[PDB]
Symmetry: C2
Subunit: 30 residues, 2 copies
């Protein structure tokens, strides 16, 4: 369960970063 | 340690949703 939550945090961080990049991309388009 | 990791997932999920909401708003303005 330790490693599973650890994998989850890392996954969510990756997703977070992708969304930040999307925001930056969309802001550039504006 | 379990509580700490759980808190981090909840934190990151919340941040994720706020970003999703912002992305969705921005897409509508540029027209995606």
């Amino acid at each position: 369960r330790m490693k599973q939550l650890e994998d989850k945090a890392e996954e969510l961080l990756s997703k977070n970063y992708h969304l930040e990049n999307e925001v930056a991309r969309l802001k550039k388009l504006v």
